[PDB]
Amino acid sequence: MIIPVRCFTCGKIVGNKWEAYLGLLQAEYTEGDALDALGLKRYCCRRMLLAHVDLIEKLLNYAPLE
Amino acid sequence: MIYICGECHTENEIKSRDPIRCRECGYRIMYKKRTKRLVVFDAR
Amino acid sequence: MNAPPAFESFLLFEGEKKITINKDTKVPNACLFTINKEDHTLGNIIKSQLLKDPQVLFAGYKVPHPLEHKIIIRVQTTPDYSPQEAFTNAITDLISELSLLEERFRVAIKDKQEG
Amino acid sequence: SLKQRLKGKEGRVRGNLMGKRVDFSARTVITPDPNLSIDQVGVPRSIAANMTFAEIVTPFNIDRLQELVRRGNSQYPGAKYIIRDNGDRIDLRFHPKPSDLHLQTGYKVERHMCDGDIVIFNRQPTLHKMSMMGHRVRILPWSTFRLNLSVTTPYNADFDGDEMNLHLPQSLETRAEIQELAMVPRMIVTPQSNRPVMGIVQDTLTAVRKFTKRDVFLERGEVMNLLMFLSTWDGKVPQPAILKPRPLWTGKQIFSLIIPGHINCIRTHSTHPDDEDSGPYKHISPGDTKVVVENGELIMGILCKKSLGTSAGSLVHISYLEMGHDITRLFYSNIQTVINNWLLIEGHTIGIGDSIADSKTYQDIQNTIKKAKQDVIEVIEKAHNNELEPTPGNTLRQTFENQVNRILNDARDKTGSSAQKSLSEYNNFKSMVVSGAKGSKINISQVIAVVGQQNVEGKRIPFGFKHRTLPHFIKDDYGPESRGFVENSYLAGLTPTEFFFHAMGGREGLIDTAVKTAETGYIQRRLI
Amino acid sequence: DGLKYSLATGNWGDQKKAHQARAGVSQVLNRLTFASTLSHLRRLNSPIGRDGKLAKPRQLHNTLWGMVCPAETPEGHAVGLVKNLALMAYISVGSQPS
Amino acid sequence: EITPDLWQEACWIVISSYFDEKGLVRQQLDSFDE
Amino acid sequence: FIGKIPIMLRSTYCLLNGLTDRDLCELNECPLDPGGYFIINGSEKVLIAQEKMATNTVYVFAKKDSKYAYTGECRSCLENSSRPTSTIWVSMLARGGQ
Amino acid sequence: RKLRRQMDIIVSEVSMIRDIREREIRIYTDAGRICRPLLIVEKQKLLLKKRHIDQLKEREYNNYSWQDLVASGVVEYIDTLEEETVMLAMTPDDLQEKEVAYCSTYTHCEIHPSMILGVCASIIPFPDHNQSPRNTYQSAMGKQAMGVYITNFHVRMDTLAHVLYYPQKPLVTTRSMEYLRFRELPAGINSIVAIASYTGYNQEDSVIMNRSAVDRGFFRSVFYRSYKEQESQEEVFEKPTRETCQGMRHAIYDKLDDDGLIAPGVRVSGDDVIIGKTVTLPTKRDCSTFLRTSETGIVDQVMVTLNQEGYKFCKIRVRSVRIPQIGDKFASRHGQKGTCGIQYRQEDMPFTCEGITPDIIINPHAIPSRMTIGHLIECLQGKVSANKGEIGDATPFNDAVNVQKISNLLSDYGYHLRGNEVLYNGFTGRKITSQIFIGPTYYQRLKHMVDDKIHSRARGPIQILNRQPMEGRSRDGGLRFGEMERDCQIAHGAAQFLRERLFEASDPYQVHVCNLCGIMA
Amino acid sequence: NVTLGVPRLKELINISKKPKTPSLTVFLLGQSARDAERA
Amino acid sequence: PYANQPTVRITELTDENVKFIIENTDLAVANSIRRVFIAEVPIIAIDWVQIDANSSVLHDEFIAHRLGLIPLTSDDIVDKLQYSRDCTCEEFCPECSVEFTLDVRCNEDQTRHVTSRDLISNSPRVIPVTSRDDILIVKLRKGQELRLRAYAKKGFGKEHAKWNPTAGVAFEYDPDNALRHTVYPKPEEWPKSEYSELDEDESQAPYDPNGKPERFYYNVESCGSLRPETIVLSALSGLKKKLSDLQTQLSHEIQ
RNA sequence: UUUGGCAUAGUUCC
Ligand SMILES: [Mg+2]
Ligand SMILES: [Zn+2]
Ligand SMILES: [Zn+2]
Ligand SMILES: [Zn+2]
């Protein structure tokens, strides 16, 4: 839905890295290099960014009730 | 009692024993407005 | 629905005593200590410190159920020495070790930064 | 019509006289709890606060019952009703007047279920009498029916979404009946086959073998812990086997403390050869088989499914027949707790490193498979040249199929034997197979070497299309691959035709499972 | 009313004669997950009695290669009688041979 | 002009084109339209 | 006017046929919704494909212990006009005559 | 065949069969035949060429598509009984090539042999390393996992709906999931699973879950339920009053507004009144609707409208967040189902050298008898992918993915090649003697929870015709004491318990009888 | 080649005069038991 | 029968990381300190949310749960504060909680990111760690609005995991397997530890029968709330106060 | 502090 604030396994904060990760990918980076640059060191933290599916972008399409 | 129309998003007063119609857009689906009562959430 | 609140694992309620002392009638000079609202974080230190004592013949601990917060410690000591004295000496030695460790860590921090 | 009302199931007689819905019953999910006794069940606080038992007021308990009534229906250790001698009911769910709270002997107070209450626990279907046994209530925080693990075998219950039923007897007469007749420790040995109906199940069983190996030497602190988990322990730490240069105990030296009384028994490990009993070293047993228990001490041997299991004459069976239910219950509980808390030191797992073989073994398996395929080709050539001679009592097709299936079975068994004998002493498949916990040598063979032939209705895969199994084969092809002999193991993966043939093979098992159940139930009902 | 009733209840036939009418068509769409929705929308059915002990039509025939999934099937009283299309399978719509 | 040992991408390009053209519930839609 | 016919979603005669994802989002419809179901009294209905034996073909079977040895049936239908099926059998009596 | 391939006179849907032995030609234009596309092999070379592949891979802004591929005579539709006169090849570049001659007259070729699996079985990774019953079980359990089921769930008043907080796409995915859109609406979370026997609470298909992970949002979801009521005497939506209405209960009417409907955002506990409706008894009868017992949800949305006829209509939705307890049911993508056994905090779970405690611990005894090696291979491939940065490919029949290649790839990141890792005990801090197999596997939270299954009864409501307890957990009914159970009690010999269960616990009664004629008096 | 298991149990419990696979094991007396000729 | 004489050495010290080595200590003490790092170090975090208006696409419990996990700088005032269960106030006073306020509305044609930058506290020393990017809370369309009031209590990681002050605590002893606490079926497949003192050919150190685990290696990484030196010091003082209170209660019971 | 029933479909567990 929206990127979680903490990494489930260890608790490192990954909730401030999604925009930077997407920007690095758009700037012609591989996913491994982007994750290395963002400081995500262990695979528990890396999977939080690798496997995330951002549905709030789709949810923002529909108009609000008011 | 204020209901918000589901198409034009305009709130209008509707009382009991009254057909549920919307002025100025002619819709038939109305949503209740969020309550003013305060509810406390733990942040867990 | 049947979820206990999280604070019940470390808060003594109205009536509960922290530690109760009971004797063991199977073997002479044996005693059991029941500690409420504790876990391995204290049980392990107290057991490993009791084992260092040369006048302690038995020293163990166990958690009877992981869903119920309670620690049982059993210590048997040689005659002319009591398990209560062994327990109190163990706690005092642990406190002394921790105080010394904190002092040395603080001086190491001071050496590391601006030094 | 009235005949329809009385006719069959859901009809009056057979649906409301021979079986009917009852009060004081609960049903929720069951989850494991190795910290309970054999005859205990964990109950959520909601169910206990909802179910009640009527206790008669006497001078021995009037103060306690009055305090329960004072607590009332809100607080869990409370009560719901007060029943007068005349029979008129007094409510306690709301706020009552202080006058009705008066209690005198001869009254009845319907208190909430508490610890130590006796209940009957059941899992449907109820096949044998070990499916409805009496348990002792213990109240636990969350909301599932916690129950021990050795009691899994009587119920045939695993903890994947299962549910079980709770029935609470309401009178002292029926409570004493259930206590003296249907309690769990009293049903350890079944009268169906005079064997113990419950035994160690697969996790204490995969670990007691490792505990009882010769190598296990225990430090002083580890012995302290394990003895701390023993409920039937005298209080004296035994002399260590190894006394210098460092005091070391042994796994057998502590299982001896677990074993009760003075039990004499002689079993045999599951890897005991056929020469030790004959040649020399009969009583020395280089591989540490030939379990011997003298005077309640494990002198020698490795404990496995054949010693602690649910077979006739096992160690648990001897313990029952010699000591009684009250001591066999403690036997089970102590074995489980001690072995689990030791397993917290040794650990256990299963992985790809445990499912992978060696290059020499792969070469052996591939050679055997190629030889078998060549032999099948030769048999087919001889049959085509009409040189095959029929076996008496068999048709030409029957004898050809028998020869082909025999060759392929020999190939599969030889590859399986190679895979077995190429294992290691640290392999976790071997750990879970030798100890009898879960698995089999055929499963190890299918994982490592060869899945094997797939059969439909007892015959090879039939010709679904016009004279061929799939559109990828020529017509009239009787090779091993055409009719569904999977040459690959589960680790290497199956080619698409073998995948489809394997699915066709597994469908038969699913169908038989879904079919046999109703007929078995009907046969049992007719016999009853 | 006829079309609405037959689609609403699933008894494929007239209301007066819902005895021999074959029930089980027109189920209510599953919405637990997207995979549930898709596998519901691509589903077959064999009208063989679910209590029939003879289980030859319940087996996996050789001719289901690429037409019907070899794995996806319910378990219980309808094992092998409810099936699902393969991924690339198509069903003809019909024409006339003029 | 053969496609040798580059097949593991060609086959999936073909399959992707199939599912872009048709979809997953084309049978119901086509049957009702007809 | 002879009545109202239910319409399958996303089909050629629905209001969502051919619309883009932005229009679907405007109508509060999920662009990922596959369609292919009816809306009957609010609920969503799905027709389940029903298997049946092929028509207009001659099949020769045999029965276990019946009077005839071999049978042959031709389930006949006419271009989905009417008269659903008419299964004519051409049997052959067994050799166990008394 | 030439005319059908040109698509000139005969539509591509028509099938043609020649029975060479029996001298018959059969042509079908019928509706209902099931068919699948196949590639065409002319002599020994596919008619599909690199020019076709390039024109397809430029599919955008080129109006070249599957129809333009079919119209070129490259692919073809083959129904079931035309497949009996065709020779197929599973893989072009492997079966068309020169070998020891098996068949040199191939007539078609398979696009990819993994297109024989359905929608629900296309999500299993490495299904060719599994067992067929396990694949069937996963096909069953894939329709019960909880994830976002549709993107416009906020305007749907569905009777029951379940949506996960933070779904993730698999780190080990099949190539054919892009067509099922499992990347866009997934259902599950990648969890660090360790296969070990820790404290005995995962025995017999149970799961130990990290409670600290759960506190951070792991496998949390919402539950939406909708209620409806219309005013079909004179039923009216209105707020009842205790001392003016005939029918009444022990519930609270103070939540309602003037017209008798709860406004959204109002927390309602079990056994409350959502919609208040009253019938004018010819002086008012209460027919209010009550929350299903013990929900404890918050009103989410209220919709007021008119039904077909013209009576006022209302649908009210209630939400309740479901935090995974110790009774909830979880399953992976390999037919391994289990319920939570107990939850440990982070300080108690075993840890690696780098402080990576597992999210889930599963028993090692589940593997040897079930033979789900796809589970282990998925774990290994996920451990490689989470470090490398790619997303692993687990399409069934590959020949370019081996356990050896995966292990070699994993050894280059500092880990043991076969996946094991030295863990430390949580309570004591000591190393565990046996190394544990740990890695990120993709788990699912099934629909079956414990709060929707717990049920108890002690003297509740009673049926009308038989005066026996009701049936149904929603109606506070009892548990049936069937004939098998009474036979078991007969075998036990507990005559008094059996009589209590069949007479006293259920309906007791008294009658009078005449001593002369056995007829009730 | 006989019937075992659930069908056999069904037949033995509800005895029918027409079993699915009736059989008759026969033992020979003398030299017919050993020599294949009289066998 | 007496205490040990532990010694420390800090290998690396940065703004989010401390690596040190404890020596001459028992494994039980080292592991107890390791456990106390995670669980019993007090931290300030949001524990009471009241949502005035939420027209966003996430429900109120979702937003509150996200708010709870935003770390607040409690470097110096975590000791001054009191537990709310231990305070004389009615519900909340400045001596036992910190109040936050969020009020964001979107009136533009571009999606707006509500971040932790928008949380405003009354006390200037308790602010989100991304306020000297930002932790995203929710995204708003045009016309959507969020507004709430939140209170930040004091607690530690045994109660909830939002009060856990650490990210990953790496603990390791005896990098070369000289004590044989773990047994390798094949010792040469296993990568050498970071602190190994072996050559490129030898895989395991030779067995040492008369040895006990000493020289534990730590690596405490902080999640931004406390700084990674005060995490260690508060653990040594926090464990020391648990033992002292046990000794007080034992002395009453004995007498 | 009072009690609807019939049918069909799907699912869980042996
Ligand atoms: Mg089960
Ligand atoms: Zn992490
Ligand atoms: Zn309007
Ligand atoms: Zn205060």
Comparing CA positions, the residue from J227, J228, J191, J197 lying closest to residue J19 is J228
Q: What is the rounded distance in angstroms from the CA atom of residue H366 to the CA atom of residue H202? A: 10
| C-beta pairs of H232-235 under 8 Å, 24+ apart in sequence | H232/H311, H233/H279, H233/H280, H233/H281, H233/H282, H234/H279, H234/H280, H235/H277, H235/H278, H235/H279, H235/H287
How far apart are the CA of H355 and the centre of ligand 2, in A? 9
Report the residue numbers after which chain C has a gap, meaning the C atom sits over 2.5 angstroms from the next written residue's N, or none: none
How many Cβ atoms from other residues are within 10 Å of residue H330's Cβ? 25
Q: Which DSSP state fits E43?
A: B
The amino acid present at H346, given as its one-letter code, is: Q
Query: Which H or E run includes H40?
Result: strand H34-40
Structure tokens of D34? 């190795």
Q: Cα(D147)–Cα(H219) distance, rounded to whole angstroms? A: 26
Give the span between the Cα atoms of D73 and D112, in whole angstroms.
8
Q: Give first-to-last CA distance, chain F, whole Å.
A: 40
Residue pair D505/D456 in contact by the 8 Å Cβ criterion:
yes
Burial environment of residue J31 by CB neighbours within 10 A (0 to 12, 13 to 18, 19 or more): buried
Q: How far apart are CA H11 and CA H29, in angstroms?
A: 9
CB D460 within 8 A of CB D405: yes
CATH of the domain at C4: 3.30.1360.10
Task: Using the Cα atoms of residue C102, residue C108, residue C110 and residue C112 in order, give the sign of their dihedral.
Answer: negative
Give yes or no for a contact between A45 and H176, defined as CB atoms under 8 angstroms apart.
no
Give the structural domain span for D286.
Answer: 203-346
Q: Among H181, H143, H178, H138, which residue's Cα sits nearest to residue H162?
A: H143
Burial class (CB in 10 A: 0-12, 13-18, 19+), D462: middle
Phi and psi at residue D135, in whole multiples of 5°? -125, 160
Do E42 and F24 touch, CB atoms closer than 8 A? yes
Instruction: Say how far residue H69 (Cα) sits from the centre of its chain.
Output: 37
> Is the sign of the CA dihedral H397, H400, H403, H407 positive or negative?
negative
Interchain proximity C1–H342, CB inside 8 Å = no
Q: What is the C-alpha separation between D312 and D291, in angstroms, rounded?
A: 15
Give dist(CA D271, CA D285) in Å, integer: 12
> At a CB cut-off of 8 Å and minimum separation 6, what does H296 contact?
H267, H268, H269, H270, H320
Cα–Cα distance between D117 and D170 in angstroms, integer?
Answer: 11
Output the DSSP codes for D9-33. Answer: TTSHHHHHTSSEEESSEEEEEEEE-
Contact C99, C55 (CB under 8 A): no
d(CA A35, CA D179): 64
Examine residue D245 and say whether the peptide bond preceding it is cis (omega within 30 degrees of 0). Answer: yes
Q: What are residue D111's DSSP bridge partners?
A: D53, D79
Q: Using DSSP, how many helices (H) and how many strands (E) does chain I show?
A: 2, 0
Encoded tokens for H341: 């056994």
Q: Which domain holds residue C46?
A: 1-115
CA-based torsion, C37, C41, C46, C48: positive or negative: positive
C-alpha span between D372 and D369 (Å, rounded): 5
Write down the catalytic residue from H68, H79, H128, H205: H205
Locate J118 and state its tokens. 């928008």
Query: Are the beta carbons of H434 and J65 separated by less than 8 Å?
Result: no
Q: Are A36 and A51 in contact (CB under 8 A)?
A: no
CA distances in angstroms from H4 to H45, H78, H87, H423, listed in the order given: 20, 12, 19, 65
Alpha carbon J224 to its chain centroid, in Å, reads 9
Q: Which of H156, H163, H164, H168 is the best substitution to test chain A (most A C-beta atoms within 10 A)?
A: H168
H216 is in an annotated binding site: no
Nearest ligand by distance to the CA of J92: 4
Residue D170 near residue D53 (C-beta atoms within 8 A):
yes
CA of H372 to C1' of K11 (A): 24
β E90-91/D217-218 pair status = unpaired
Which tokens is I31 given? 């030299």
E80 touches strand K (CB under 7 A): no
Contact at CB, E93 and F30, closer than 8 angstroms: yes
B-chain CB neighbours of J142 within 8 Å are none
Count of residues for chain B?
A: 44
Domains and CATH numbers, chain A: 1-66 (1.10.10.60)
Please give, rounded to a whole number of angstroms, the shortest distance from the CA of H112 to a CA of chain E: 10
Neighbour-count burial of C100, counting CB atoms closer than 10 A to its CB (0-12 exposed, 13-18 middle, 19+ buried): middle
Which residues of chain B does H315 touch, with a Cβ-Cβ cutoff of 8 Å?
Answer: none
Q: What is the DSSP string of D396-458?
A: HHHHHHHHHHHHHHHHHHHHHHHHHHT--TT-HHHHHHHTSSS--HHHHHHHHT--EE-EETT
Q: Residue H371 has which token pair?
A: 């033979």
Specify burial of residue H440 (Cβ count, 10 A radius: 0-12, 13-18, 19+). buried
Residue B28 belongs to domain with CATH number: 2.20.28.30
CB D89, CB D81: distance < 8 Å: yes
CB H268 within 8 A of CB H253: no
> In sequence order, what are the beta bridge partners of H224?
H161, H319
Q: Identify the residue whose tokens are 């662009």.
A: G31
Closest-CA residue of chain I to D523: I10
Alpha helices (H) in H121-240, listed in sequence order:
132-141, 211-215
List the alpha helices (DSSP H) in chain G.
21-26
Residues H147 and H188 sit within 8 Å (Cβ to Cβ) = yes
* Cα gap H140→H123, rounded to integer Å: 12
Q: Which of H448, H181, H135, H116 is nearest to E37 (CA)?
A: H181
Q: Report helix angle D205-212 to D251-258, nearest 10.
A: 130
CB-based contacts of D325, cutoff 8 Å, min separation 6: D183, D185, D186, D188
The phi, psi pair for H227, rounded to 5°, reads -120, 145
Distance CA G69, CA D140 (A): 70
Say which amino acid occupies D40: Q
Q: Count the helix, strand and coil residues of chain E and give each as a percent rounded to the nearest 5.
A: 20, 10, 70
Alpha helix (H) residue ranges in H58-204: 66-70, 92-95, 132-141
Instruction: Confirm or deny that A31 is annotated as ligand binding.
Output: no
Could H35 and E72 be called an inter-chain contact, meaning their C-beta atoms sit closer than 8 Å?
Answer: no
Contact C97, J24 (CB under 8 A): no
End-to-end CA distance of chain B: 34
Question: Contact at 8 Å (CB) between E83 and E39?
Answer: no
Q: What is the CA radius of gyration of chain B?
A: 14
Q: Which residue, G34, G35, G15, is CA-closest to G23?
A: G15
Here the tokens at position E86 are 């393969």
**Gaps in chain E following residue numbers (C to N > 2.5 A):** none
Q: J183 CA to middle of ligand 2, Å?
A: 28
State CA J33 to chain mean position distance: 13
Bridge pairing between strands H206-210 and H337-344: parallel
J25 vs C contacts (CB less than 8 Å): 97, 101
Distance CA J65, CA B44 (A): 5
Token pair of J181 as six digits = 């606490």
Q: Which residues of B touch H (CB under 8 A)?
A: 1, 3, 6, 15-17, 19-20, 28-35, 37, 39, 44
Length of chain C: 115
Whether residue G36 and residue F33 make contact (CB cut-off 8 A), yes or no, is no
Q: Can you name the residues that pair with J113 across neighbouring β-strands?
A: J139
Query: How many domains does one find in chain B?
Result: 1
Whether F22 and E93 have beta carbons less than 8 Å apart is answered as no
Q: Which two tokens stand for residue D229?
A: 């988990």
What is the three-state SS of J15-74?
CCEEEEEEECCCHHHHHHHHHHHHCCCCEEEEEEEEEEEECCCCCHHHHHHHHHCCCECC
CB-CB contact of H50 with F2 (8 Å): yes
Do the beta carbons of residue J54 and residue H362 sit within 8 Å?
A: no
Identify the DSSP state of H361: E
Residue D394 φ then ψ, to 5°: -135, 155
Q: Is the CB of H470 under 7 A from strand K?
A: yes
- Whether the CB-CB separation of H242 and H281 falls below 8 Å is answered with no
| Integer Cα distance of D511 and D502 in angstroms | 14
Please say whether the beta carbons of H126 and H138 come within 8 A.
Answer: no
**J169: nearest Cα among H10, D114, H424:** H424
The whole-number Å distance from H317's CA to K14's C1' is 37
Cβ distance D135 to D184 under 8 Å? Answer: yes
CA distance D89 to D99: 14
| Pairing mode of beta strands G68-76, G43-46 | unpaired
CA distance H388 to H408: 13
Rg (CA), chain C: 18
What is the spatial distance between Cα H193 and Cα H209, in angstroms, rounded to a whole number?
Answer: 10
Burial H126-150 (b: 16+ CB within 10 A, else e): bbbbbbbbbbbbbbbbbbbbbbbbb
Structure-determination technique: cryo-EM
Tokens linked to D507: 């469908």
Q: Is the dihedral of CA D405, D406, D409, D411 positive or negative?
A: negative
Contact assignment for H50 to F20 by CB distance below 8 Å? no
Nearest in space to H185 (alpha carbons), one of E42, G33, J113, G25: G33
State how far residue H159 is from chain G, nearest Cα, in angstroms: 10
Domains of chain J (ranges plus CATH)? 1-42+162-255 (3.30.1360.10), 43-161 (2.170.120.12)
Task: Tell me which amino acid residue D452 is.
Answer: G
Q: Sign (positive/negative) of CA torsion D14, D17, D19, D20? A: positive
Cα–Cα nearest to B30, from D327, H13, H306 = H306
DSSP codes joined into one string, D324-391? -HHHHHHHHHHHHHHHHHHHHHH-----HHHH---HHHHHHHHHHHHHHHHHHHHHHHHHHTT---PP
Q: Which of D203, A51, J70, A8 has its CA nearest to residue H209?
A: A8
Cα separation of H264 and H301, whole Å? Answer: 5
- Subunits in contact with chain D (3 or more CB pairs closer than 8 Å): C, E, H, I, J
Q: How far is the CA of H250 from the C1' of K2 (A)?
A: 10
**Euclidean distance between CA atoms H273 and H252, whole angstroms:** 6
For the domain that residue D226 is a member of, what is the CATH number? 1.10.274.100
What total of structural domains would you count in chain C?
A: 1
Strands (E), chain I: none
Closest ligand, as measured to the CA of D155:
1
Cα–Cα distance between H408 and H415 in angstroms, integer?
10
In this structure, what token pair is assigned to residue D11? 């009809």
**Strand, helix or coil at C49?**
helix
| Burial J240-249, CB ≥16 within 10 A → b, else e | beebeebbee
Non-local (6+) Cβ contacts of G81 within 8 A are none
Q: Beta-carbon neighbour count of residue J215 at 10 Å?
A: 16
DSSP string, D81-130: EEE-TT--EEE-SS---TTTT---TT-EEEEEP-TT-EEEEE-SS--SGG
CA distance J174 to J197: 10
E57, E47, E51: which is closest to E24 by C-alpha? Answer: E47
Q: What is the DSSP letter of H392?
A: E
> Rounded to whole angstroms, how far apart are CA atoms H177 and A53?
14
Range(s) of the domain holding residue B28: 1-44
H393: annotated active-site residue = no
What H or E segment, with its residue span, contains residue J154?
strand J145-155
Question: Please, are residues D150 and D308 in contact by the beta-carbon 8 Å criterion?
Answer: no
Q: Which of H178, A55, F24, H157 is nearest to G10 (CA)?
A: F24
d(CA J55, CA B33): 11
Question: Taking each helix axis from N to C terminus, what angle separates D359-384 and D396-421, rounded to the nearest 10 degrees?
Answer: 170
Residue spans of alpha helices (H) in H131-278? 132-141, 211-215
Resolution (A): 7.7
| Amino acid occupying residue H511 | V
Which residues does a gap of C–N over 2.5 Å follow in chain I?
none
**C1' of K14 to CA of D141 (Å):** 29
The span from the CA of D66 to the CA of D57, in Å, is 9
